[PDB]
Motif scaffolding. Structure first.
Motif, PDB file in Angstrom:
ATOM      1  N   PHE A 176      22.450  37.520   7.533  1.00 20.11           N
ATOM      2  CA  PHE A 176      21.946  38.585   6.661  1.00 20.11           C
ATOM      3  C   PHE A 176      23.031  39.613   6.328  1.00 20.11           C
ATOM      4  CE2 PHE A 176      17.422  37.823   8.524  1.00 20.11           C
ATOM      5  CZ  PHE A 176      16.984  37.126   7.387  1.00 20.11           C
ATOM      6  N   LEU A 177      23.821  40.028   7.326  1.00 21.87           N
ATOM      7  CA  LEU A 177      24.909  40.990   7.143  1.00 21.87           C
ATOM      8  C   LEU A 177      26.011  40.440   6.230  1.00 21.87           C
ATOM      9  CD1 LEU A 177      25.190  42.447  10.769  1.00 21.87           C
ATOM     10  CD2 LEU A 177      24.142  43.559   8.808  1.00 21.87           C
ATOM     11  N   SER A 178      26.386  39.161   6.366  1.00 20.01           N
ATOM     12  CA  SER A 178      27.407  38.538   5.509  1.00 20.01           C
ATOM     13  C   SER A 178      27.009  38.492   4.031  1.00 20.01           C
ATOM     14  CB  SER A 178      27.752  37.128   6.002  1.00 20.01           C
ATOM     15  OG  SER A 178      26.690  36.209   5.822  1.00 20.01           O
ATOM     16  N   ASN A 179      25.704  38.480   3.736  1.00 16.97           N
ATOM     17  CA  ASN A 179      25.163  38.489   2.374  1.00 16.97           C
ATOM     18  C   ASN A 179      24.717  39.894   1.916  1.00 16.97           C
ATOM     19  OD1 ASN A 179      24.529  37.156  -0.060  1.00 16.97           O
ATOM     20  ND2 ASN A 179      22.632  36.349   0.635  1.00 16.97           N
ATOM     21  N   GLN A 180      25.132  40.959   2.619  1.00 19.63           N
ATOM     22  CA  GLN A 180      24.779  42.358   2.321  1.00 19.63           C
ATOM     23  C   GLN A 180      23.259  42.641   2.309  1.00 19.63           C
ATOM     24  OE1 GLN A 180      27.137  43.618  -1.139  1.00 19.63           O
ATOM     25  NE2 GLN A 180      29.010  42.896  -0.299  1.00 19.63           N
ATOM     26  N   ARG A 181      22.447  41.790   2.951  1.00 18.60           N
ATOM     27  CA  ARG A 181      20.982  41.928   3.058  1.00 18.60           C
ATOM     28  C   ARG A 181      20.607  42.742   4.298  1.00 18.60           C
ATOM     29  NH1 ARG A 181      18.418  36.000   1.542  1.00 18.60           N
ATOM     30  NH2 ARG A 181      16.538  37.116   1.316  1.00 18.60           N
ATOM     31  N   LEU A 182      21.086  43.984   4.364  1.00 22.33           N
ATOM     32  CA  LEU A 182      20.905  44.856   5.529  1.00 22.33           C
ATOM     33  C   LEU A 182      19.426  45.170   5.824  1.00 22.33           C
ATOM     34  CD1 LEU A 182      22.426  46.486   7.748  1.00 22.33           C
ATOM     35  CD2 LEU A 182      22.593  48.328   6.102  1.00 22.33           C
ATOM     36  N   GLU A 183      18.588  45.302   4.791  1.00 22.61           N
ATOM     37  CA  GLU A 183      17.146  45.559   4.946  1.00 22.61           C
ATOM     38  C   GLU A 183      16.414  44.414   5.664  1.00 22.61           C
ATOM     39  OE1 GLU A 183      16.789  48.855   1.349  1.00 22.61           O
ATOM     40  OE2 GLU A 183      15.547  47.013   1.145  1.00 22.61           O
ATOM     41  N   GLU A 184      16.832  43.167   5.447  1.00 22.06           N
ATOM     42  CA  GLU A 184      16.241  42.003   6.114  1.00 22.06           C
ATOM     43  C   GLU A 184      16.718  41.846   7.551  1.00 22.06           C
ATOM     44  OE1 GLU A 184      16.061  39.638   1.945  1.00 22.06           O
ATOM     45  OE2 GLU A 184      16.537  38.484   3.746  1.00 22.06           O
ATOM     46  N   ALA A 185      17.980  42.193   7.820  1.00 24.44           N
ATOM     47  CA  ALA A 185      18.488  42.289   9.182  1.00 24.44           C
ATOM     48  C   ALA A 185      17.676  43.311   9.993  1.00 24.44           C
ATOM     49  CB  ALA A 185      19.979  42.649   9.136  1.00 24.44           C
ATOM     50  N   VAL A 186      17.411  44.489   9.415  1.00 29.86           N
ATOM     51  CA  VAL A 186      16.564  45.525  10.030  1.00 29.86           C
ATOM     52  C   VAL A 186      15.143  45.014  10.250  1.00 29.86           C
ATOM     53  CG1 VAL A 186      15.532  47.842   9.630  1.00 29.86           C
ATOM     54  CG2 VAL A 186      17.934  47.489   9.229  1.00 29.86           C
ATOM     55  N   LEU A 187      14.521  44.408   9.232  1.00 35.74           N
ATOM     56  CA  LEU A 187      13.171  43.855   9.343  1.00 35.74           C
ATOM     57  C   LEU A 187      13.087  42.796  10.453  1.00 35.74           C
ATOM     58  CD1 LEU A 187      10.485  44.026   7.223  1.00 35.74           C
ATOM     59  CD2 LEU A 187      11.035  41.604   7.158  1.00 35.74           C
ATOM     60  N   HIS A 188      14.105  41.940  10.586  1.00 33.24           N
ATOM     61  CA  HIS A 188      14.159  40.926  11.637  1.00 33.24           C
ATOM     62  C   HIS A 188      14.287  41.539  13.034  1.00 33.24           C
ATOM     63  CE1 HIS A 188      14.748  37.068  13.532  1.00 33.24           C
ATOM     64  NE2 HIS A 188      15.893  37.542  14.048  1.00 33.24           N
ATOM     65  N   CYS A 189      15.105  42.582  13.200  1.00 28.72           N
ATOM     66  CA  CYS A 189      15.235  43.314  14.464  1.00 28.72           C
ATOM     67  C   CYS A 189      13.943  44.047  14.871  1.00 28.72           C
ATOM     68  CB  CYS A 189      16.399  44.304  14.341  1.00 28.72           C
ATOM     69  SG  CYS A 189      17.980  43.410  14.256  1.00 28.72           S
ATOM     70  N   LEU A 190      13.138  44.500  13.904  1.00 30.33           N
ATOM     71  CA  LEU A 190      11.876  45.219  14.136  1.00 30.33           C
ATOM     72  C   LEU A 190      10.684  44.311  14.494  1.00 30.33           C
ATOM     73  CD1 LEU A 190      12.151  47.882  11.297  1.00 30.33           C
ATOM     74  CD2 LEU A 190      12.295  48.345  13.719  1.00 30.33           C
ATOM     75  N   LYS A 191      10.827  42.986  14.380  1.00 31.90           N
ATOM     76  CA  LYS A 191       9.741  42.041  14.678  1.00 31.90           C
ATOM     77  C   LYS A 191       9.275  42.166  16.141  1.00 31.90           C
ATOM     78  CE  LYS A 191      10.650  38.610  11.094  1.00 31.90           C
ATOM     79  NZ  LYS A 191      11.332  37.326  10.791  1.00 31.90           N
ATOM     80  N   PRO A 192       7.961  42.277  16.416  1.00 38.78           N
ATOM     81  CA  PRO A 192       7.445  42.498  17.769  1.00 38.78           C
ATOM     82  C   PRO A 192       7.757  41.344  18.733  1.00 38.78           C
ATOM     83  CG  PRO A 192       5.615  41.950  16.305  1.00 38.78           C
ATOM     84  CD  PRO A 192       6.866  42.173  15.462  1.00 38.78           C
ATOM     85  N   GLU A 193       7.906  40.113  18.234  1.00 35.47           N
ATOM     86  CA  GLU A 193       8.297  38.950  19.042  1.00 35.47           C
ATOM     87  C   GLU A 193       9.700  39.112  19.655  1.00 35.47           C
ATOM     88  OE1 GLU A 193       5.617  37.860  15.580  1.00 35.47           O
ATOM     89  OE2 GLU A 193       7.607  38.802  15.751  1.00 35.47           O
ATOM     90  N   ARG A 194      10.533  40.012  19.110  1.00 35.77           N
ATOM     91  CA  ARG A 194      11.898  40.277  19.589  1.00 35.77           C
ATOM     92  C   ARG A 194      11.945  41.137  20.843  1.00 35.77           C
ATOM     93  NH1 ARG A 194      12.409  36.171  18.223  1.00 35.77           N
ATOM     94  NH2 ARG A 194      11.772  35.615  16.167  1.00 35.77           N
ATOM     95  N   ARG A 195      10.814  41.684  21.301  1.00 42.26           N
ATOM     96  CA  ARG A 195      10.756  42.446  22.562  1.00 42.26           C
ATOM     97  C   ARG A 195      11.204  41.625  23.769  1.00 42.26           C
ATOM     98  NH1 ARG A 195       5.137  46.145  22.024  1.00 42.26           N
ATOM     99  NH2 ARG A 195       5.839  47.300  20.277  1.00 42.26           N
TER     100      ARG A 195
END
Lengths: 113, 798, 57
Positions: B175-194
């Motif tokens: 996501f970062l390599s494609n400048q899609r910073l909002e999707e990187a943030v959305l992926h980090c915020l996913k509750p399954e990532r706890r």
């Protein structure tokens, strides 16, 4: 206190002989027994659950075998019951196969270390 | 012994001189090749296997072995050729297909053979992490067409394995390599990532992405910015916690410094009146900051950077500040329980940890918290704390700690009843981790109090029965809460003994138990493997296909826990279990629970008695080569202690017969032991017999029985007082304070009235008749239910 | 491949499936789910819906 093995079986076989299709009714009677067996067994005891499904099928197969043996060959009602008896036998042996193969597969996956 | 080159060569020459034909010489070539390989003579091994292959061209093992020799030489293309030939001759070698794919990708990723071998390997090992890495390497070389296929591959692997840290990091980097910073943030915020918050690389990546996002959006007052700032403080706190556990002191200082600066940056945005979710998180994270600062100071003392004495009072102030942070006031907003319950669980974890550490650091000094507040809860004390943590790197104005108000600290000692409530809250975040459970159990053990293991185990395992009727079963599905309780009691005891044996040379200011992040593993890898297997099986979190292996681990060590044949337990462990279960069972108001705990206590006493007979005979107890619980020779039962343990076993048998409602058998059994604890139980039995007779209109026969029961009660209570007057050390053996014995003796004197003080009938002269028949304490073997209805159980728990 | 056969059998006419077979299919899917085996969720939902409709009838 004391002794069930011959009178209850005669009464249940005699009740199913009054049903319009004893094969369909044997199948229907097992629906609560399957759910009950599923609810009684924790998710850790999945193979004891399949052994209980095999046992539940075998009880009904034994009942239907007693019904089919008591009847003169040639009544069209009992050809359907004989087909359902064969299908319940196929169900019972399929559960036995599932228990044997999946027990080995799960055990093998734990021992590969 | 490695055979020398000269020994192998003499053996080969002799084996070649004895061979009748050139073909027979070459047939021995595979054995010679293996001998030369064990000698690291790879050139001679190659010649020997090549001479064998020229006679046995269809042997897959020879082609595989020749491929291994070429691989060790770095001749990857010849190795791949020999491995292909081995795989052609025997296709059952699935491992060789993976090795060929790895070797081709290592040689040249742009080779069109690589895609074929990786896809062939993918069909043989679906979801292998190594195949994912080979596919990643191939697709990373293909530019934009490779990007879409790599994205689809990562989504498929995350669907198969949501908790893989490496695959999750790669999705964020993509996501970062494609400048899609909002999707990187959305992926980090996913509750399954706890579940990934236990990994340092993941938490550091989340911190990086959120800082970059907040930097990119500076000037936009968005609700999303407050949520990301909240999750950034949580992720910074996790990085500090993980660095304290997995890294050195210097990296822990740098992690705490980055967290200090993060709190300082948010402090200006949090006015003290705003009940915002960010304000609640900021105050919660302030408590965690001080808990981690106190833990870092104790870590610096453990690394010998500073003496314990200099860092105990500063660390205790940090734990005091952490303990006093108020819990988030839960408004139960009907509908989204997942976010606010988590901060409450963190608050319980902080308060449990900080409160137990305050009690550990005080060493039982009554004014310790007061002395710390006076010395360090001021601006000079803050400046000293800042210098210990950050040296000269941060000023008082550039630090959160330096700008924070620590002057308003209450002189509050942690209450044990409140700590027990906080411990029950902390169990939710740790999800039944054995290190956490053992650490809490040790804290309670250092306080000389039994840990509330029953409450903890019911919370972790809500579907497990308290007891089993089949103690002789070793089936994993037969596990009960009492098997888990004795396991935890033995882990805590063995951890305590291991800490004592390591502490015989330690600084007197050293904490008896260190904070969890810096505390060494309290249990063995076998204890871990058993507990994690039980946890995974019961919670249904076991990986597909592993359940057979987990059942075998459980089944083996369950025989030990139930003291089955050849259990290999040290007697001191059985004594500790029986005592722990006796105390827990006696404290329960539930008849059924008392009966189960007493029944299991009596089971371990019955298993211990034959071992006490061996100790009396001065015979050694068998020790296993790899025991589930380590043997500690400093706790080996002495021949002098055997009688007191036999008497304690008899008391436990009499208590079980009392709980079963066999009051007469229990009286006879207690009268036989002739100990203060038995006299106390006899007094309680006769008092209860008198209270059962006390109805406001007694017949004359029931009035005589009432008076006889009170006289017997007075007799046994007097014997306890007479023994206590002779030996004041008996107060430690009494189940109750001696004051309660005196209060009961004086109540029984008041009920008897003054009129009977002068006629003692000789209390022991008339029961010298019944000879020796071994009272068989039989547990009932399972005889089929015959319902005879004619004895209502006379024992209601009043 | 077993889930593809189940999808075909449900498509060829839900009313032709015998009650014991729908029971067996349902309990086999619950067994696979208990083992953590990946079955086609769409077909699993359709077997369950068809069995629930039979239980209602």
């Amino acid at each position: 206190l004391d002794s069930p093995s011959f009178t209850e079986d005669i009464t249940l076989s005699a009740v199913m002989l009054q049903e319009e299709d004893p094969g369909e009714a044997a199948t229907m009677s097992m629906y609560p027994d399957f759910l009950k067996s599923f609810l009684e067994h924790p998710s850790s005891a999945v193979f004891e659950l399949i052994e209980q499904y095999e046992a539940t099928c075998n009880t009904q197969i034994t009942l239907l075998k007693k019904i089919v043996k008591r009847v003169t060959p040639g009544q069209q009602k009992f050809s359907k019951t004989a087909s359902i008896l064969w299908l319940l036998q196929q169900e019972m042996v399929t559960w036995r196969l599932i228990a044997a193969l999946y027990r080995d597969r799960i055990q093998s996956a734990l021992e590969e270390e | 012994m490695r055979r020398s080159k000269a020994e192998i060569q003499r053996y080969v020459e002799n084996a070649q001189n004895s061979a009748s034909s050139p073909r027979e010489k070459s047939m021995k070539g595979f054995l010679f090749a293996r001998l030369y390989y064990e000698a690291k003579e790879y050139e001679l091994a190659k010649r020997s296997v090549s001479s064998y292959i020229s006679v046995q061209e269809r042997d897959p093992k020879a082609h595989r072995f020749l491929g291994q020799l070429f691989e060790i030489e770095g001749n990857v293309e010849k190795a791949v050729g020999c491995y292909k030939r081995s795989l052609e001759l025997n296709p059952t070698q699935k491992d060789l297909t993976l090795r060929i794919a790895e070797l081709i990708c290592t040689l040249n990723i742009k080779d069109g053979r690589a895609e074929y071998w990786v896809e062939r390997a993918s069909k043989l090992f679906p979801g292998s992490p190594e195949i994912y890495r080979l596919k990643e390497q191939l697709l990373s070389s293909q530019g934009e067409a490779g990007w879409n296929q790599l994205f689809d591959l990562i989504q498929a692997e995350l669907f198969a394995r949501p908790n893989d840290v490496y695959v999750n990091l790669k999705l964020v980097d993509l996501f970062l390599s494609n400048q899609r910073l909002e999707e990187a943030v959305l992926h980090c915020l996913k509750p399954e990532r706890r579940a990934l918050r236990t990994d340092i690389e993941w938490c550091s990546c989340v911190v990086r992405v959120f800082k970059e996002y907040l930097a990119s959006k500076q000037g936009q007052k968005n609700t999303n910015m407050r949520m990301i700032t909240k999750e950034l403080l949580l992720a910074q706190c996790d990085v500090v916690f993980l660095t304290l556990s997995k890294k050195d002191v210097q990296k822990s200082k740098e992690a705490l410094e980055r967290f200090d600066q993060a709190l300082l940056s948010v402090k200006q945005s949090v006015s003290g009146t705003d009940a915002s979710d960010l304000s609640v998180t900021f105050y919660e994270m302030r408590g965690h900051y001080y808990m981690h600062a106190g833990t870092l100071l104790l870590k610096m003392a453990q690394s010998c950077e500073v003496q314990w004495k200099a860092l105990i009072e500063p660390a205790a102030l940090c734990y005091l500040l952490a303990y006093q942070v108020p819990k988030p006031k839960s408004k139960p907003v009907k509908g989204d329980d997942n976010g606010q319950g988590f901060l409450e669980e963190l608050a319980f974890d902080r308060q449990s940890k900080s409160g137990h550490l305050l009690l550990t650091l005080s060493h039982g000094k009554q004014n310790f918290i007061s002395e710390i507040i006076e010395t360090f809860a001021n601006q000079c004390g803050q400046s000293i704390l800042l210098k210990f943590l950050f040296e000269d790197n941060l000023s008082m104005q550039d630090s959160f700690m330096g700008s924070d108000d620590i002057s308003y600290v209450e002189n509050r000692v942690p209450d044990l009843s409140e700590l027990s409530q906080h411990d029950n809250g902390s169990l939710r975040i740790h999800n039944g981790d054995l290190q956490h459970l053992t650490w809490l159990g040790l804290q309670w053990h250092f306080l000389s109090t039994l840990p509330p293991l029953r409450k903890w185990l019911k919370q972790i395992f809500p579907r497990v029965p308290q007891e089993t009727s089949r103690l002789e079963s070793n089936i994993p599905e037969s596990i009960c809460l009492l098997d888990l309780e004795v396991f935890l009691l033995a882990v805590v005891q063995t951890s305590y003994l291991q800490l004592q044996d390591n502490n015989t040379t330690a600084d007197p200011n050293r904490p008896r138990c260190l904070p969890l992040p810096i505390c060494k593993q309290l249990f063995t890898d076998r204890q871990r493997s058993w507990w994690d297997a039980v946890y995974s099986l019961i919670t249904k979190k076991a990986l597909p296909g592993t359940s057979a292996k987990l059942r075998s681990v459980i089944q083996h060590d369950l025989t030990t826990l139930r003291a089955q044949e050849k259990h290999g337990l040290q007697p001191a462990v059985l004594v500790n279990w029986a005592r722990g279960l006796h105390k827990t069972g006696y404290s329960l108001n539930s008849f059924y629970d008392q009966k189960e705990y007493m029944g299991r206590c009596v089971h371990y006493w019955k298993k211990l008695l034959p071992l006490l007979d061996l100790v009396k005979q001065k015979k050694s107890i068998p020790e296993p080569v790899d025991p589930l619980f380590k043997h500690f020779h400093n706790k080996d039962i002495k021949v002098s202690e055997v009688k007191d343990l036999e008497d304690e076993a008899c008391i436990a048998f009499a208590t079980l017969d009392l709980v079963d409602g066999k009051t007469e058998d229990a009286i006879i059994a207690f009268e036989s032991v002739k100990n203060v604890v038995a006299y106390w139980n006899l007094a309680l039995i006769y008092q209860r017999k008198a209270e059962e007779i006390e109805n406001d209109c007694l017949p004359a026969e029931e009035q005589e029985e009432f008076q006889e029961c009170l006289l017997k009660c007075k007799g046994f209570l007097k014997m306890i007082c007479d023994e206590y007057s002779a030996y004041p050390s008996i107060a430690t053996s009494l189940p109750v304070p001696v004051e309660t014995v005196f209060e009961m003796l004086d109540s029984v004197k008041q009920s008897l009235g003054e009129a009977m003080d002068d006629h003692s009938p000789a209390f022991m002269e008339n029961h010298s008749v019944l000879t020796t028949s071994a009272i068989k304490h039989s547990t009932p073997s399972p005889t089929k239910l015959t319902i005879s209805p004619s004895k209502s159980a006379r024992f209601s728990p009043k | 491949g077993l889930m593809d056969e189940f999808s075909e059998w449900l498509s060829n006419g839900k009313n032709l499936l015998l009650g014991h077979l729908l029971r067996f299919m349902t309990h086999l899917l619950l067994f696979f789910r208990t083992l953590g085996l990946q079955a086609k969720e769409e077909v699993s939902v359709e077997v369950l819906k068809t069995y629930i409709q039979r239980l209602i009838n």
